[PDB]
Amino acid sequence: SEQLQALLLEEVMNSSTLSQEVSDLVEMIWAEALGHLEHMLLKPVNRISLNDVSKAEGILLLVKAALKNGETAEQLQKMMTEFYRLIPHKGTMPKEVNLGLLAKKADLCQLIRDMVNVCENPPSLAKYRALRCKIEHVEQNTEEFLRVRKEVLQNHHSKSPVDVLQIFRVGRVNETTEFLSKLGNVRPLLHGSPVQNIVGILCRGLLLPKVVEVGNLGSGIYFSDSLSTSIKYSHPGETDGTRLLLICDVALGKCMDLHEKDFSLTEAPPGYDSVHGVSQTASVTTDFEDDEFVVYKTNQVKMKYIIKFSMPG
C-alpha cells in the first residue's frame, strides 16, 4: 500500500553498510563533544537554539572591543550577564573578563552550534553525515595499516609503549581541491589535538587560531614529525579513553629554520611558506624543545588519517 512502500524505502535508505569501528568512533567524538559541554553547562545543549548562539557571539565582540577601549568592569558585568542568560554556565562565574575568557566563550559557542546542527534519521548516521567527510576503516591485515603505523613509529624521542588501536582514512570534500598541491615540500606530519575538538576539525578542517594581544610561532596550525611531542597535545578521552591524532599532508614548502621564538607572526615570514621550530639538539641553541612545523593558511593542510591510540596510563 502507499505508506508501506515508503517505510520499505526508509529501511533500505537508512541501512548504510558502515563499519562498526567508524560507528563507534563517530559515536565517541560526538558523545565526547557533548560531554565537554555538559561539564560546565546548567541548561542541556538540546534546549539551546541557533538564535541564542548567534546572539552570544555578538555580545562577545562588543566585550572584546570594550576591554581594548579600557572600560570599567561594572559595564563588562552587565553585558556578560546577558551572555550568561542565553548560555547558562555553572560553578564560579568568571568575574574578571579578559581576552582569554572571551576566546574560550567563543569556542564553547562554536561547539554548541555544531551540536544543534547534528540533532534532528538515526543518531549514528546523522552524526556521520553532519561531519560531511569520508571516514573509512582500515584492517590490520592490510599492508596500508603497517605503512601508517611505521610512519607514526619512527621519530620517537620518548620511549613509552605506543598502542596503535584503530586507524581510519579521512579526507574533506572541499579541502582536497583547494589544497595547495602545486606548492613544494608536500610531506605528512602529525597534528596533536584533544578528542572533544575532533568533531569540529572533521567538519570545518584545521582553522587558524584567533589572535590574542599559547603558540610560540604565532597564530598558525602547529604540527610535529615526532609522536612523543604530539602526546602532550592530545590528552586522553573521557568517553572511551583513547587519544586521537590527525596525520595530514602539510604543504610547508620553503621553511624557515628559526631558533628564536616569534609570537607576532599572524602569517608566515617573508620569502618562506612555513616555520620549523628546530628542536633542541646536541649543541644548537634553540628555545624550541619539540619539533614544530607551522603554516598560516587553511589550504596548506590536507588531512589523511586519524590515529586512535592509548598510553599506558
Residue numbers in the entry: 242 to 361, 368 to 460, 469 to 568
What is written in the article reporting this PDB entry?
PARP4 is an ADP-ribosyltransferase that resides within the vault ribonucleoprotein organelle. PARP4 is an ADP-ribosyltransferase that uses NAD+ as a substrate to synthesize ADP-ribose modifications on molecules. The PARP1-homology region of PARP4 includes a BRCT fold, a WGR domain, and the catalytic (CAT) domain. However, PARP3 and PARP4 contain the catalytic triad H-Y-E but are considered MARylation enzymes, indicating that other structural features are important determinants of catalytic output.
We reasoned that the bound EB47 molecule could potentially influence the positioning of the HD relative to the ART, thus we sought a PARP4 CAT structure with no compound in the active site. Crystals of the PARP4 catalytic domain alone diffracted to 4.2 Å and belonged to space group P212121 with eight molecules in the asymmetric unit. The refined structure has a crystallographic R/RFREE of 0.277/0.331. Despite the modest resolution, the structure clearly indicated that PARP4 HD adopts a similar orientation relative to the ART regardless of active site occupancy. The HD conformation was consistently open in all copies of the CAT domain within the two crystal types (10 copies total). Since these copies occupy different crystal environments, we deem it unlikely that the open HD conformation is a product of crystallization. Here, we have determined crystal structures of the PARP4 catalytic region that indicate that PARP4 indeed contains an HD domain, but the HD conformation is quite distinct from PARP1 and biochemical analysis indicates a more ‘open’ PARP4 ART active site relative to PARP1. In the collection of PARP4 structures determined in this study, the N-terminal helix adopts several conformations relative to the rest of the HD/ART folds, suggesting that it is flexibly attached to the catalytic domain. In contrast to PARP1, the PARP4 catalytic domain was clearly active, consistent with the structural observation of an open and accessible active site.
